């Protein structure tokens, strides 16, 4: 007989306790049972100042589970969601100041740049000495009967500067602020859809909020590791190795882990033409990805080497010459003798250089070894810069390497993108620093998984310093990461920092930031 | 969990042993991140699939917080019911919230244990070459009738 | 202060009823019924006797008496397809279960192979007496004869099949405890024989000589003296139970062999005494007519030794003593470097060992040397044993065998050496201190874990013997980690039961 | 159908059934019943004893509400789990009229400090005087913060009893207080297991110290106990194990000999005038290549010269007797004698012994074959100038590692459990130890949970009245409350209770005439 | 309080003189810390310990506010309770508060 | 401490422990022998605890 | 576990001695670090100093 789901089973004891122990232990505690959706809950902060315009837009927003601490968790179990969620303003500015700020709502669709243009729209407006707070709902527009996790098209809730913040005083150190709290809520409609255990992954996705490390002091670097050490604006973001698509995809050549290169070293000289040279070998890929090239090939050296001098020491510049040997041995003790650090090379062996395209087309080639053949691995460890120069690893379009097609992302409708700033040993480049164009963590996943992120949304993570300083990040499709602003100063920025997913947002969309 | 009783198994070997806790539910687990105490009992599901003409049985007890589980006879003498190796429909357990503090933090140990223990041995009338045969026994669990969480947490909020 | 709110709140979470021991039935045995056992032999036979349901196994070292009835239910567990009947006979106080067949002229009951429900009975509370002592035997018996043979079709394992019927028991609804007694307190003729037996087989000496438990051996006969205490305090052995070696005084070659040819011989005074004149720990077994000739150095040209190692006792001072090497035991006066005299403890006692000084020491047996050809486990030999003037024994008691238990004891040619021992050392320190409840006609009786299901009976009787159910369990099968578990006052000549693969 | 329950089954009549109800009655006439006679009537607990030297506010008696201060409700205790209610205390002072005091018992709340102090006099106490020629009466409400309590909590009330004024005696003794205890008609035990179902998840202090003196040999060196010691430090390297299971030492708690090697090298010493040398190697190891079990204490520099006579030595190391391991023939050995044990480097005859067990490993002894041998440490002596005991000096004390040691802890001082050892011009021979036997083969085989700044303190108590707390550390040692204290009125015949957890660095207690 | 008392103390020897307060008691000297004035009476459980060999009495007298509360015979001579050496017994008096004023500062 | 030649001067430097060589003959992986992992003052071990290895 | 810890700083600014050495209390620093032995006392009587206060 079929046995039910619900179960259909016997039931069995043997010496019980009360029940009223469970009324005892609600006294205790006066746990109601679905307490989560009766509170709004905090969500950002935003500045109404006297040097913003009538329509400066102030908050963009759309429609998304994921903006509610709670509401965010109980979604990892299920599927799907519909209905509206509120959204309570708490505008608390003085008696005496004017000005006005209106609340639209745009149709999915609809851009949000932020003129004059969108007061237009129906809208509500609020005075600036309000005092109860104003409870917003942002209507489900949709054209499935339900959403799916990672759908992004909905409805916006925009708040535009209708009248600006006046105060009948104005004083020397001219500036004076009215500070917006946004908060949610579940609406009245709000219902989740079909079940999953959190557990079980879909087949043509994976939830965003595991692409960033909780804490900072996890995070690493993609180009060349190290500890983290803060944030980078850049006007164009530029990467082909260790970079992966939100498709699963690479235009680069090697595997996330950064666990070494593996090599031959080949015996063939070709290299002593002069007496000042250390010699060049030919290498031998172990393990290729595509096109033959090494797995973990450095990303970053340019035009040429040059092994005049090098007989002596390693000094010759902006060439990453100090690769680290260690042996691949399987049966007994080393062949090969002493195996010093060793320089990286691609292309054509001259008699005393080697000449490089930008591309890694031709055969590669290493620093000498004063011995005969090797299976290696080697770590790439120091970077040779220039006799003089500022600009940390990867600051030169012409020096980073390609294969085929070379990953950038460009500023995209006024979202900066950012580069992941790390510490690896250089020559004379005070604070050394590398270039990252995704954390080690966000490149280890986007390599195992599908994730759902779409062409033209952004998988935006809420960083929060020690002591309060916060600013947004969003992972675009493409893999890179955007910020808000161009020139947010970092520096500021407190050491150790903790990351929230706030949920996918609308590409376009400025993204907002606070740090003083 | 799934548990192997055998032709090899002893008149009280322990097949399973299990304490009241809420993260053995794929989802209540869930729930958890949620909140910073729970109380009273949750339920468990066994589905003794044997054939027919199996005999044995398998016995079900309930020990005091505290009062450890070696897994001799000696546990047999607890109060016990005992099902049946030919049984069909399932058995549904509950495993009674024994507590001295009023509500229970998440990280809480001591509690009773549902422990099964083989009362008498899965008897194949059936005997051959390459011998030994065993039964499935399936354990799926579920929150309790009286099963609630306390106090709310943001599930990004880590306790002292 | 108080108040009864907090025992109502106590009784909430934890739902005690106040006497709930009698509610539940509690394990007992399981009895295995073998596809080869023939008709009437007794599957079960058990007296009634608090001492079964742990709880009031419990309850009952607290009070001194006992009435109502038991009930014993029984959980036959065969597949549907076992053919098989099962009778159950009720047996008036004080007639015997002698063999199994006649008693089915009883008045008797069928239990079938294939019941789907367990069988409750309540052996019924017969007695002369308003109210039973905790060892009074004179009880009636429940015994559980095969009827019809248990059946199965199947052979293609064409034998050892079998079937597992399980006992559990409660008070009935009239048990009841008489008089209130401190824990620990003595009735009049005897202590509690539940303390006899460690726990644990990590606690397991044997009584004979100091070792790790290593299993047992039984025997149509048994036989000791030394350190064997009876369930009454005698003790006609020589020595206190504590294994702490013999303490000699040692005289010097006055009669020692004058025309030696190997290390002399010595004669020695006990110093302590618990009979007269015979050193408190003289090793009981050796070989009588022992030839100390040959013996310059090496002592591996002696027959039956009992080697000691040697150290000094209340010297007080410079340690004026030799090299104490090792010591040969001995007795009976010779005219040369023999020893002749044997089956007796009666002629003086002598030390084989290159010694000079006179004064007083401590021996252990340590060592044992032996034939080229032993097969048999120290004390085999009737003729070996040594008495003051009295051997106790046993024999098959009313179809019960004595075992041996045995242990390890370093012993020359012997491969896998060992030593019977008829009392382990815990039952021989008690039993030393304390007079014992077991009757003249009784058998206190424990039970024996290992793993696997295995379990046999071991009673003791009056005069301290160990004995068993069959003549040859295959004790091999068993595995160490052995536990006791006291059961109950045994008729003596009922028959132990047993229950191993 | 298929389901069994707790309690059912078909019921079957066999024979003579003869009429239960009508015996019942008849047996319930000839001995009355109540539903529980040992809540009826006061049953001895203990007596401690109270001397004239007591000043004001000394505590004579500590007593956390348990089960176990009553023996009926001790012994029921095994078959349950849990226990609820107050139990009533019947005390009486015994005592020459002549002699005159007060005595004053308070019923200390879970959250107070049961040390003494006028203090404690301040709070509901019944007082009874050395004359008042009658018992006093008096409850100990059970006073919760949990529903029910544990066999082992230990946020009990508490019982105190104070000298409240001193015992005065015209002539110039101590008297004797007994306690006799009740089930109040609260108590109630809780959740039923059966006995030998031992204790929670036998991480279970109480089973740390045995019951008995009988069973207390200890881990330094065999033998039958003679009391204790207290020094401002304490320490030891072998048979020593911490709360972890942790051990710095070489040695198995087993006690039992050492399974050693004899290489037939006689390592040309001078042919006369000592026995020689042989290196040694151990059959088996714990740790390091350290044998299992050579001696933790012997003197440095041992000079083996004029040996051959006698072993008349200096500063011993330990002589031990030996047997052989076991053979298949007759017998390879010859002979055997007394070996004398030593470590680090044969240097010359005489054997150069460090600090540290590091070195090679050496046995003094006419041995010349090869084989496997049991040797037993069996006796020991220093030069005549010495009287301490087996264990006193740091030096000798070998150490592989870390040697762990006790300070003075927190108004603690560690103690030594002396045992006799064989031993010669050294009065009264006796060999420390920083723990029990017991307490060495328990930490072996299960952790426990001793806290990182908690002990485990024990009630040790003299036949005559006398008593004292013993708490073991996290590191194994054994703690008292006080530098100095009469041990030697002890009665030899002691018995332990588990008193329960408290903590470290609060003084422990103590009542000796 | 303990007080001593001495076989050289002659008769009329005060051992103990205490006007009433809340100094008197511990719990009640505690709380006396919040408040600026009292009223009410105390009672008074005195005993004493000695060895039933020893003999004398001691006299426990409520001295009402305007009597001097040295020793002398005289002071016997108004209501007294009085406790043997051998009395094996506290004995129980009450101090009532006499007062001229309608409360007491502290 | 000390560690293996430098051909030359002073440096402030960092180093990645890479290769092992073991003895000329065994089968033990790293971290096999009891006496030859180090320590400060205490070792952590986990011996099998209620029978969980 | 305890005395009650009110009785710790005395009431009164005229009271303040420190423990290092005699003087008038004049004001106090702060430090990101701090480290004395002597006559420095935990709240559970343990003391790594030397000296009685």
Redesign the interface.
């Known amino acids: 007989?079929t046995?039910e789901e619900q179960?259909?089973?016997?039931?069995?004891?043997?010496?019980?306790?009360?029940?009223?122990?469970?009324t005892?232990?609600?006294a205790?505690?006066g746990?109601m049972?679905e307490?989560?959706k009766t509170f709004f809950?905090y969500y950002t902060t935003v500045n109404w100042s006297t040097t913003d315009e009538t329509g400066k837009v102030l908050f963009v927003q759309g429609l998304s589970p994921r903006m509610n601490?709670?509401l965010?968790?109980l979604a990892?179990?299920y599927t799907g969601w519909s209905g509206s969620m509120e959204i309570r303003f708490t505008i608390s500015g003085s008696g005496v100041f004017g000005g006005k700020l209106a609340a639209v709502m745009v149709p999915p669709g609809i851009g949000t740049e932020g003129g004059t243009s969108l007061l237009q729209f129906p809208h509500v407006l609020v005075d600036a000495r309000q005092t109860e707070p104003v409870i917003f709902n942002i209507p489900d527009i949709r054209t499935v009967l339900w959403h799916d996790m990672h759908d992004t098209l909905t409805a916006h809730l925009v708040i535009l500067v209708y009248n600006d913040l006046l105060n009948p005083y104005q004083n020397t150190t001219t500036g004076t602020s009215c500070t917006v709290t946004v908060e949610t809520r579940g609406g009245t409609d709000f219902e989740f859809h079909l079940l999953k255990?959190?557990?079980r992954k879909m087949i043509f996705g994976a939830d965003p909020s595991r692409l960033i490390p909780k804490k900072s002091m996890f995070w690493e670097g993609n180009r060349l590791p190290g500890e983290f050490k803060g944030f980078s604006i850049k006007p164009l973001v530029f990467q082909a190795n260790r970079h992966f698509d939100c498709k699963r995809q690479t235009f680069g050549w090697s595997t996330p882990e950064h666990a070494g290169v593996k090599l031959n070293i080949q015996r063939q000289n070709l290299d002593t033409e002069d007496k000042t040279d250390i010699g060049v070998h030919l290498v031998t890929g172990l393990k290729t990805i595509k096109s033959q090239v090494p797995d973990g090939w450095p990303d970053y050296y340019g035009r040429n080497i040059i092994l005049a001098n090098t007989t002596a020491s390693f000094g010759e510049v902006s060439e990453a010459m100090l690769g680290?040997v260690?042996?691949y041995?399987v049966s007994g003790?080393l062949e090969w003798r002493h195996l010093p650090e060793i320089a990286f090379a691609n292309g054509t062996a001259k008699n005393s250089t080697i000449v490089c395209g930008k591309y890694l087309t031709g055969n590669f080639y290493v620093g000498g070894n004063f011995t005969q053949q090797g299976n290696v691995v080697v770590?790439p460890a120091f970077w040779t810069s220039k006799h003089g120069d500022t600009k940390c690893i990867g600051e030169d379009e012409d020096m980073v390497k390609r294969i085929d097609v070379l990953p950038q992302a460009q500023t995209t409708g006024g979202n900066y993108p950012i580069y992941y700033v790390t510490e690896f040993?250089a020559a004379y480049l005070p604070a050394p620093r590398v270039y990252n164009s995704q954390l080690l963590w966000t490149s280890r996943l986007l390599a195992q998984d599908v994730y759902d992120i779409g062409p033209e949304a952004l998988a935006v993570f809420k960083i929060k310093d020690s002591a309060g300083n916060w600013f947004d990040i969003g992972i675009s499709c493409e893999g890179f990461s955007f910020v808000g602003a161009p020139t947010l100063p970092f520096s500021s920025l407190q050491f150790p920092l903790e990351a929230?997913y706030v949920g996918m947002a609308s590409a376009y969309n400025k993204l907002q930031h606070n740090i003083a």
């Open positions: 007989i046995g179960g259909v089973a016997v039931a069995t004891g043997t010496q019980p306790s009360a029940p009223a122990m469970a005892l232990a609600t205790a505690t746990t049972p307490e989560w809950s601490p709670f965010d968790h990892k179990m255990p959190p557990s680290t260690v042996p041995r003790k770590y040993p929230s």
